[PDB]
Amino acid sequence: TDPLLPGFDYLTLHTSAARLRVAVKGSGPPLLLLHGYPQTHLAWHRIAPRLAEDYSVVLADLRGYGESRALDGADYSKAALARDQLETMGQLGFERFAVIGHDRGARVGYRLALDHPQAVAAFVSLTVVPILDNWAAVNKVFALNAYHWFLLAQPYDLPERLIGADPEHFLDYTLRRMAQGRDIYHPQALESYRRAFRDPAVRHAMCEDYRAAVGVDADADQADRDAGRRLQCPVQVLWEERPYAAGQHPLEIWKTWAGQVEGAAIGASHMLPEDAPDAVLEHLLGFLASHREALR
């Protein structure tokens, strides 16, 4: 078995509003990789090493997730976490960079691209469309499948009380569900996800993410829609192979948010980074190579 993140240098960055866990490797154009829920930067362990052969790779734990913490009533909106990313990359020497996000990290990523277009050279979303589009699609089956979007958004401290009683049960159930029962979690990465979820501050930060998704994040998306503001960089979307209702296909949705869009279906679960790393890498590498001028 290969080790986890060979040659990555683990850092703690001190920013205006947060203490952020960052891991870096490589040389060349900069890429920032942003995990999702209920995970940490280790979700990238099957992808980041290959990328670091050709690029400067930065992995971060999102504010409140993993080992990253707000300095503190902290703001856990996507806009705030986007500012964390600008500050992170700037501290490391990068004023403009590509962003590759999965799940909540893709939500941070597109909000960064909309708010700070000068900073984002290219954007890749794994599984995600803007939250405004998600909310428009809510129906019975949406709400059953994604029940946690509604639970975790309830007022403080309802969901924290429910998910906090036996955190590892809930974490493990959630990861199994998201993976469709597939054996995709490296046992050591799993212990890291578990440790983070056992921290009440992490669980709270996750609920705040979901609260923001209902409220300020959706309001920000609507304001950009109203203004006709689009992402300015090339966009790639890689989506789970599953049926999409009319108007809900991720490629169609991204074309309403960006003028330069491509993508592909991947035959895996929602957990693309861990479940289908080779497929993801093929697509990522091709995209970054085809837009090599954009990265300059």
Active site members: 103, 270
Asked if 292 is part of the footprint of its own copies (rule: CB under 8 A), the reply reads: no
Q: Which is nearer to Cl ion, 62 or 261 (CB)?
A: 62
The smaller minimum CB distance to Cl ion, of residues 103 and 274, is found at 103
**Smallest gap from residue 138 Cβ to its own copies (A):** 5
The DSSP secondary structure of the chain, one letter per residue, reads -PPSSTTPEEEEEE-SSEEEEEEEEE-SSEEEEE--TT--GGGGTTTHHHHTTTSEEEEEPPTTSTT-EE------SHHHHHHHHHHHHHHHT-SSEEEEEETHHHHHHHHHHHH-GGGEEEEEEES---HHHHHHT--HHHHHHTHHHHHTTSSTTHHHHHHHSSHHHHHHHHHHHHTTT-----HHHHHHHHHHHTSHHHHHHHHHHHHHHHTHHHHHHHHHHHHT--B-S-EEEEEESS---TT--HHHHHHTTBSSEEEEEESS-S-HHHH-HHHHHHHHHHHHHHTHHHH-
Question: Which C-beta is closer to Cl ion: that of 94 or that of 110?
Answer: 110
Question: Which of residues 169, 182, 198, 292 is near its own copies by CB under 8 A?
Answer: 169
Told to check if 1 binds its own copies by CB under 8 A, we report: no
Q: Is 216 in the site for its own copies (CB under 8 A)?
A: no
The footprint of Cl ion (CB under 5 A) covers 103
Binding to its own copies (CB under 8 A): which residues in 148-167? 149-151, 153-154, 158, 161-163, 165-166
Task: Single out the segment in contact with its own copies by CB under 8 A; choices: 53-61, 65-73, 79-87, 146-154.
Answer: 146-154
Q: Which residue is nearest to Cl ion (CB)?
A: 103
Which lies closer to its own copies via its Cβ, residue 44 or residue 197? 197
